[PDB]
Design an enzyme around this catalytic site. Structure first.
Site, PDB file in Angstrom:
ATOM      1  N   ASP A 101       0.822  -1.204   0.000  1.00  0.00           N
ATOM      2  CA  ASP A 101       0.000   0.000   0.000  1.00  0.00           C
ATOM      3  C   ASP A 101       0.862   1.262   0.000  1.00  0.00           C
ATOM      4  OD1 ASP A 101      -2.006   1.873   0.144  1.00  0.00           O
ATOM      5  OD2 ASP A 101      -2.641   1.392   2.212  1.00  0.00           O
ATOM      6  N   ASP A 107      -1.132   5.488  -5.552  1.00  0.00           N
ATOM      7  CA  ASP A 107      -1.665   4.677  -4.459  1.00  0.00           C
ATOM      8  C   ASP A 107      -2.004   3.254  -4.906  1.00  0.00           C
ATOM      9  OD1 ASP A 107      -2.754   3.656  -2.179  1.00  0.00           O
ATOM     10  OD2 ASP A 107      -4.562   4.953  -2.212  1.00  0.00           O
TER      11      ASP A 107
HETATM   12  C1  LIG Z   1      -6.187  -2.382  -4.436  1.00  0.00           C
HETATM   13  C2  LIG Z   1      -6.619  -2.941  -3.120  1.00  0.00           C
HETATM   14  C3  LIG Z   1      -8.070  -3.280  -2.893  1.00  0.00           C
HETATM   15  C4  LIG Z   1      -7.456  -2.073  -2.209  1.00  0.00           C
HETATM   16  C5  LIG Z   1      -7.216  -2.110  -0.706  1.00  0.00           C
HETATM   17  O1  LIG Z   1      -8.362  -1.558  -0.058  1.00  0.00           O
HETATM   18  C6  LIG Z   1      -8.155  -1.186   1.336  1.00  0.00           C
HETATM   19  C7  LIG Z   1      -8.020  -2.472   2.181  1.00  0.00           C
HETATM   20  C8  LIG Z   1      -9.487  -0.514   1.734  1.00  0.00           C
HETATM   21  C9  LIG Z   1      -6.976  -0.259   1.474  1.00  0.00           C
HETATM   22  C10 LIG Z   1      -5.681  -0.643   2.160  1.00  0.00           C
HETATM   23  C11 LIG Z   1      -6.637   0.325   2.833  1.00  0.00           C
HETATM   24  C12 LIG Z   1      -6.287   1.788   3.031  1.00  0.00           C
HETATM   25  C13 LIG Z   1      -5.630   1.972   4.422  1.00  0.00           C
HETATM   26  N1  LIG Z   1      -5.915   3.384   4.727  1.00  0.00           N
HETATM   27  C14 LIG Z   1      -5.240   4.127   5.682  1.00  0.00           C
HETATM   28  N2  LIG Z   1      -5.616   5.413   5.791  1.00  0.00           N
HETATM   29  C15 LIG Z   1      -4.953   6.105   6.735  1.00  0.00           C
HETATM   30  C16 LIG Z   1      -3.947   5.564   7.512  1.00  0.00           C
HETATM   31  C17 LIG Z   1      -3.658   4.228   7.307  1.00  0.00           C
HETATM   32  N3  LIG Z   1      -4.297   3.477   6.384  1.00  0.00           N
HETATM   33  C18 LIG Z   1      -6.965   3.936   3.871  1.00  0.00           C
HETATM   34  C19 LIG Z   1      -7.514   2.698   3.135  1.00  0.00           C
HETATM   35  C20 LIG Z   1      -8.163   3.022   1.790  1.00  0.00           C
HETATM   36  S1  LIG Z   1      -7.047   3.750   0.564  1.00  0.00           S
HETATM   37  C21 LIG Z   1      -5.515   3.000   0.994  1.00  0.00           C
HETATM   38  N4  LIG Z   1      -4.505   3.329   0.124  1.00  0.00           N
HETATM   39  N5  LIG Z   1      -5.299   2.207   2.031  1.00  0.00           N
END
Ligand SMILES: C[C@@H]1C[C@H]1COC(C)(C)[C@@H]1C[C@H]1[C@]12CN(c3ncccn3)C[C@H]1CSC(N)=N2
EC number: 3.4.23.46
Length: 391
Positions: free
Chosen positions: A38, A234
Site C-alpha cells: 500500500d 496509491d
Molecule cells: C487495491 C486494493 C483493494 C485495495 C485495498 O483496499 C483497502 C483495504 C481498503 C486499502 C488498504 C486500505 C487503506 C488503508 N488506509 C489508511 N488510511 C490512513 C492511515 C492508514 N491506512 C486507507 C484505506 C483506503 S485507501 C488506501 N490506500 N489504504
C-alpha cells in the site's frame, strides 16, 4: 536490458480489485504472512487475532523477539477501520533483500470492512512517509527502518501485472501478479525510457498533473483542478479516482468518444458490469487517456497514456457465461486524484525516495492490443507548472 534483481522479480500476487501482496515473515521463529502493498499509507499492520477472512494471523506469544510498545492504534478511514496494539519484532521479506530488520508492527485485534474475503492477504505494508503514520509521525514506517538498519538503497519499484481477464482465488494463488524490487530498478520489467516527476512533498507519494487529454483532446480545465486537493500514487486503491469536477468532465469526454455504443448510467458510476461476446470487446471505441506530469527540468512535462485495457477492470459475469465482462475503473473523489492499481498496471513505477521523484515507464506486463499500447513520452514545453499544485 539486463534484469539485475532476479530474487525479487515475480514476488507479487493478486489483482487490482483486491490488492497486490508480498510474502513477509514476522517474529522468531518466522511466521509467514501475505502482506498488501500500500503506497497510500504508512503503517505495517498484521491480523493478530481470528477473523472470518483470515486463514492465519500473527501470534505474538509465539515470538521470542516480540516487544510490546504498550500503546493502542486506531485507524478509521472512509469505507472501514482497523485497530490494534503496537509492538516491534524482527521482519523479513523472503523474496526480498537478504536482510532482517526490527520494525514497528500494529497487531490488528479488531477491524471492520478492512480484510477482503478471498484476497489471500493478512496484513498491510504502508510504504508512504511518517507524516501519515498512525497514531502519529513518531511511529517509524517499515521502509524507513529497513533503510536505516541496512545498506538497502532508499528506493523501491513496483510492476503490478493485471491479467486482462478475471482470476478466481485458485488462479490468483497460482499466478504471478508482478514485482516489488526493494532497493533497485530492474530493467527487464519495462520498455522504453523512464521519465521522472517530482515528489511534491513527502507524506503521500504526491505528484502534480499539469494536463489531461482524452484521445488527444485537452480536457482544458485549470490544472489546479486536476490536483484538488492533492494527487497521489496509491497501490492500495483499485481505481483511477478523479476530483468531482474533473470526473464529470472526463466522463463526459469518454462517453462522447465511445458514443457508438450506449452504456447505462450504472456502468459509468463504476457499479455495474458490462459484457461482450467472448473476444469481441470493442477496445477501439474507447479512448486513450493521457496524464501529463511535471518533469524534473524547468518548464518540461511528460505524459503517461493508458488504454481501456487499463481503465476497464475485468470481472466475472453475474451469470455463467463465456462473455468478457468489465467494470469502469474510473471514479469520483473528494480527496484528490488517486492513481490507483488500474493505472499502475500500465507502468513500471519507480519510487525514488533518495531523489524525491517518481519514475514511470511502459510496463513489460501491460495489457494491450495489436493497434495501441500504453506510452510514456516526452518532453513537452509546459509553463507555470508549480501553479498546478493546490495549497
Ligand atoms: C487495491 C486494493 C483493494 C485495495 C485495498 O483496499 C483497502 C483495504 C481498503 C486499502 C488498504 C486500505 C487503506 C488503508 N488506509 C489508511 N488510511 C490512513 C492511515 C492508514 N491506512 C486507507 C484505506 C483506503 S485507501 C488506501 N490506500 N489504504
Amino acid at each position: 536490458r539486463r534484469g539485475s534483481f532476479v530474487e525479487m522479480v515475480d514476488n507479487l500476487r493478486g489483482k487490482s480489485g483486491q490488492g497486490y501482496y508480498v510474502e513477509m515473515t514476522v517474529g522468531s521463529p518466522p511466521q509467514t504472512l501475505n502482506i498488501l502493498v500500500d503506497t497510500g499509507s504508512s503503517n505495517f499492520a498484521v491480523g493478530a487475532a481470528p477473523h472470518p477472512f483470515l486463514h492465519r494471523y500473527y501470534q505474538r506469544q509465539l515470538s521470542s523477539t516480540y516487544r510490546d510498545l504498550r500503546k493502542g492504534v486506531y485507524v478509521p478511514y472512509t469505507q472501514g477501520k482497523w485497530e490494534g496494539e503496537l509492538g516491534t519484532d524482527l521482519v523479513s521479506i523472503p523474496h526480498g533483500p537478504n536482510v532482517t530488520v526490527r520494525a514497528n508492527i500494529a497487531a490488528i485485534t479488531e477491524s471492520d470492512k478492512f480484510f477482503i474475503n478471498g484476497s489471500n492477504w493478512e496484513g498491510i505494508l504502508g510504504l508512504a512517509y511518517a507524516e501519515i503514520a498512525r497514531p502519529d509521525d513518531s511511529l517509524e514506517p517499515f521502509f524507513d527502518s529497513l533503510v536505516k538498519q541496512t545498506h538497502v538503497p532508499n528506493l523501491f519499484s513496483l510492476q503490478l501485472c493485471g491479467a486482462g481477464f478475471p482470476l478466481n482465488q485458485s488462479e490468483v494463488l497460482a499466478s504471478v501478479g508482478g514485482s516489488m524490487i526493494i532497493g533497485g530498478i530492474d530493467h527487464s520489467l519495462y520498455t522504453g525510457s523512464l521519465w521522472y516527476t517530482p515528489i511534491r512533498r513527502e507524506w503521500y507519494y504526491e505528484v502534480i498533473i499539469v494536463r489531461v487529454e482524452i484521445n488527444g483532446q485537452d480536457l482544458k480545465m485549470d490544472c489546479k483542478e486536476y490536483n484538488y486537493d492533492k494527487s497521489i500514487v496509491d497501490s492500495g486503491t483499485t481505481n483511477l479516482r478523479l476530483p468531482k469536477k474533473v470526473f464529470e468532465a472526463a466522463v463526459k469526454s469518454i462517453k462522447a468518444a465511445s458514443s457508438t455504443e450506449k452504456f447505462p448510467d450504472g456502468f459509468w458510476l463504476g457499479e455495474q458490469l458490462v459484457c461482450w461476446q467472448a473476444g469481441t470487446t470493442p477496445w477501439n471505441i474507447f479512448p486513450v487517456i493521457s496524464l501529463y506530469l511535471m518533469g524534473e527540468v524547468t518548464n518540461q512535462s511528460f505524459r503517461i497514456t493508458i488504454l481501456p485495457q487499463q481503465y476497464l477492470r475485468p470481472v466475472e459475469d453475474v451469470a455463467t457465461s463465456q462473455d468478457d465482462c468489465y467494470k469502469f475503473a474510473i471514479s469520483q473523489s473528494s480527496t484528490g486524484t488517486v492513481m490507483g492499481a488500474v493505472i499502475m498496471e500500465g507502468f513500471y513505477v519507480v519510487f525514488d525516495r533518495a531523489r524525491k521523484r517518481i519514475g514511470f515507464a511502459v510496463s513489460a506486463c501491460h495489457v494491450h492490443d495489436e493497434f495501441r499500447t500504453a506510452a510514456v513520452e516526452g518532453p513537452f514545453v509546459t509553463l507555470d507548472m508549480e501553479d498546478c499544485g493546490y495549497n
